[PDB]
Copies of this chain bind each other. A is one copy, B any other.
Amino acid sequence: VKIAHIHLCGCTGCLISLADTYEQLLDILNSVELVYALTLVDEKTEIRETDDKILIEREIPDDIDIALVEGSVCLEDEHSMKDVFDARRKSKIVVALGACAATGGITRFCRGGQMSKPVHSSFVPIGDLIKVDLALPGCPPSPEALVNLITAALNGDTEYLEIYAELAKKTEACGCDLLVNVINKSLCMGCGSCAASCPTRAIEMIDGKPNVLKELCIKCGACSLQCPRIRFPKLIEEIE
């Protein structure tokens, strides 16, 4: 299986989370063929020499099996737009890796004006422009979640992946998802697992109910992914 890491308007933290499989990363990289990742390999190098110029380019290779796409798309940057469409064209399976790619995340707050590209102001999750096959939320998703997603993809564990295939259809996330879909619907039982899932500590349990500190929410989607009163597929009931 040929895999690639495509980095759009991200921070590389989702790749570092993959690197935080530590020694196990070598096992992972031996179960797949990493064919593209600007941070890690010198692929795919194409040289175009003319009389006046040598152009040494690194291109996305064709025939990728799984593309791990991190970061959002900058609508005002031509290269950002070209790369997201090229990733889709060249890959059979596109994963929106992390909140930036899956739902915008922190880049939802971008609004332009900063040097040296003040025109850069509009950032969108990749699924606003291309078909996404699987989406991993979080900022970043844990190493464990990534291991599970890769293992399931290699073993054809479609049942395990269904929750992430379903997430790929939704390009917005927010702490108020817990209110709209759980608390307001007479489903919240006060386990507090959403609070423990949140990377910014934006959720506080008060009197058995989640209180979202909205100005701290970075729209990562980890809490609604966790809440067992939203998704609780039967496969979770199979224990050792």
Q: Which residues of B contact A213 (CB under 8 A)?
A: 215
Given contacts A176-B174, A214-B214, contact A184 B113 (CB under 8 A): no
Q: Which residues of B contact A107 (CB under 8 A)?
A: 184
**Distance in Å: Cβ of A5 to nearest Cβ of chain B:** 24
**Distance in Å: Cβ of A78 to nearest Cβ of chain B:** 13
**Distance in Å: Cβ of A202 to nearest Cβ of chain B:** 11
Instruction: Closest B residue to A172 by CB, please name it.
Output: B180
The answer to whether A185 touches B75 (Cβ under 8 A) is yes
Say whether A183 faces chain B, with CB atoms less than 8 Å apart.
Answer: yes
Q: Kindly identify, within residues 218 to 232 of chain A, every residue whose CB is under 8 Å from any CB belonging to chain B.
A: 219
The answer to whether A111 touches B176 (Cβ under 8 A) is no
Q: Which residues of B contact A122 (CB under 8 A)?
A: 183-186
The answer to whether A183 touches B75 (Cβ under 8 A) is no
Say whether A108 faces chain B, with CB atoms less than 8 Å apart.
Answer: yes
**Distance in Å: Cβ of A72 to nearest Cβ of chain B:** 9
**Distance in Å: Cβ of A67 to nearest Cβ of chain B:** 22
Q: Which residues of B contact A179 (CB under 8 A)?
A: 108-109
**Distance in Å: Cβ of A76 to nearest Cβ of chain B:** 7
Q: Which of B104, B111, B121, B185 contacts A124 (CB 8 A)?
A: B185
A112 to B34, CA, bound (A): 51
Q: Kindly identify, within residues 90 to 110 of chain A, every residue whose CB is under 8 Å from any CB belonging to chain B.
A: 104, 107-110
Given contacts A108-B176, A172-B180, 6 further A-B contacts (CB under 8 A): A75-B185, A107-B184, A108-B179, A113-B209, A121-B209, A176-B219
**Those 10 A-B pairs whose CB atoms lie nearest each other, nearest first:** A214-B214, A122-B186, A111-B209, A75-B186, A113-B207, A108-B179, A215-B215, A214-B215, A124-B184, A122-B184
